Paper text:
Escherichia coli phage SU10 belongs to the genus Kuravirus from the class Caudoviricetes of phages with short non-contractile tails.
All hexamer-hexamer and hexamer-pentamer interfaces in the caps are arched (145°), however, the hexamers that form the tubular part of the capsid are connected by two types of interfaces, arched (145°) and more planar (160°).
Author numbering:
A (entry chain G): 3 to 51
B (entry chain D): 5 to 51
C (entry chain G): 102 to 349
D (entry chain C): 52 to 94, 102 to 317, 323 to 349
E (entry chain E): 52 to 151
F (entry chain E): 303 to 349
Write the structure that this text describes.
Amino acid sequence: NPTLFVSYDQNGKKLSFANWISVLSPQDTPFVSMTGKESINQTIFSWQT
Amino acid sequence: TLFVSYDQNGKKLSFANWISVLSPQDTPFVSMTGKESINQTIFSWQT
Amino acid sequence: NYGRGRELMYQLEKKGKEIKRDLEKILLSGQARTDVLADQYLTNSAADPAVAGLNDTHAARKTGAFQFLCAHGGLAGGVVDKTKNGPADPDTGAVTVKVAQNASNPTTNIGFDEADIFDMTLQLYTAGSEADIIMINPAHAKIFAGLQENTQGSRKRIFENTKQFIYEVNSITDPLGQSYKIIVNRWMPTDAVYFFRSADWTQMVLRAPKRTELAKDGSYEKWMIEMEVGLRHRNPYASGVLFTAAGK
Amino acid sequence: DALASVDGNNAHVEGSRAEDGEMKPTVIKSNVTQILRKVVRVSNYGRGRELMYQLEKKGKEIKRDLEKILLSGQARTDVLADQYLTNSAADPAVAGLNDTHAARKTGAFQFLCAHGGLAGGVVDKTKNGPADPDTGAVTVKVAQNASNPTTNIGFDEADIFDMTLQLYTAGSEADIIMINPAHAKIFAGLQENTQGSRKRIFENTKQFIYEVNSITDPLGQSYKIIVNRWMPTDAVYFFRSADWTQMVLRAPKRTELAKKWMIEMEVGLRHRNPYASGVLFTAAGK
Amino acid sequence: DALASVDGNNAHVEGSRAEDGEMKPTVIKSNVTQILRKVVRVSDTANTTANYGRGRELMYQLEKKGKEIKRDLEKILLSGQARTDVLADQYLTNSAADPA
Amino acid sequence: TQMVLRAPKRTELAKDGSYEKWMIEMEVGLRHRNPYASGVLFTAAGK
């Protein structure tokens, strides 16, 4: 339509989304993630105070 | 926790201009003779 | 899609992050222990009493946190009472958990008084824990900073033509020669502080984080994450905690 | 929008029997772009060619206007609110008359920073923002200067540290703070006090440095301060480089109308996440 | 979209171009892309049993069902159907149509 | 032209007490261009 270019009636638009998702969430685990493991078999363990 | 990562769908695509055309392109004179152009606004011929 | 990649791997990573956050909160919280096994013939006679024979519900399953008394005073039913001073260890005599009052400060400024830290350190010293670490949540570090501000003039800062200003404190030295470092965690009850110890106090996992799934009923994309971690302390009278001043 | 909550207890009894999950997927946010004209109209000691001079002057003026607007409290207002597409209707009564022109208004800074209201077209400067479901954090709060009996309009000594705490809880990682020169005196005097716990020293020094350009909350978050005269006096901002981006559609073009000189710059504002940046209004409660 | 309305007369003036038209997002909505379904629930004794003409009943019924779904698809594309799904596309300014 | 979503494929879902289930899950769709481009002619005895 070379006569006049109009914008409000523009059909078949392109939403122009963003290829990224800000998933910011607090998850640091400073020390508790760096303690270790003592894998066991049962679920009734103890430590003999 | 709870990573699914199946619903991104960040397509963000635009239109493609798939419109239809109905243009007849016979052009008999332009194809056979060529180009001819008058200069004045009025033209006459004798018979 | 336009911003999403897939509906399974994305959701799977989501659930993994969520399960890690859940574990982090559960370990450092008031997750009272609730078990049904009142075993009496233990100590090298491992058996389940006649009860719990054929039934397969087994609802109650929890651990840790006071109920898991952890050297606390007392809890009110299914909720941990953050108002009960701990017992006295007969070894030397020391309470590792107490509740200071908010009378030295206004009746609306919930927090410590700069003297409870040293009291806790002395209690630990008498108990012989040798703890040197602090896990505290926000809204209480400002106390660690302004301990040298809410005074009469005795303590004071200095700024020698320096454009920087600082209210950060990540270490203190007890008068007993015990150095303590501060580390901020956000999964706390925002009303207490933990004088926990180093990695010596470790946890143990029975079923590591692993995926399973059922095949199909008519149609679905089911998945599972069923880690079975558990916690463990060591000589509960060693470490200690300090609740904040609320009143009663 | 956010990650899923913690939910606290997650014990189980050897059985899933789920409810199709509680995903509750993200929310889709958008923004609009506006237009700036700054027309030029020409109808001689040293100026000579005044055209280029006035053109550069108007360019600087439009840049200043952009810097003033993007930091205002405007709120995007247009016929479309959440159904921006409406490809079916899309203002059907537009073609044929072409005189239904509405005014494109873009979203401002204070509108995208997790606001809690707006006075029609401006953000309300007396109402704190809501809380994000991920972790309880109020990134927009009404300042409360508990030092004076509501007489002086100034930041409290511990009102920016509250913002730092909230951001750390929400995980913004911002490290910049813009401020109007009508408030730098506050941070300048903050290095001193009357109780006697904070005081400068001069050990045979021929200098009187009275300035602050760095802060570190007890949480260990550094914050660099910068001054900008194009901000509203009754507000302070907590910026961050990557969290804010400037979207542009039409670059500044020097041209003329249909068959004078003029400029036309289509620009819009984008913000990665509302609960990342922080704003704080300065006033007394009433 | 629209192409033209009328041809008529082409005489024009230097100012007879006031205005004509309006603007509203396109009315092309969507296609729902219906789905098909064919299943069997053969047992084990059935798959193990034998019979004349065919072998494992399971594969026989599975192939029959494949042919049947092919026929069903071929027939559906020719019958009279109209889409009325509740997932109205409605893009474009109030896009993504997720208020329901 | 058609609008196959992923594909026509056969696969089994979770079984039962000596059952055996299978599914196809074929998903397609049509696509006409210029609705005013294909002819239709019904047959009627009258109106």
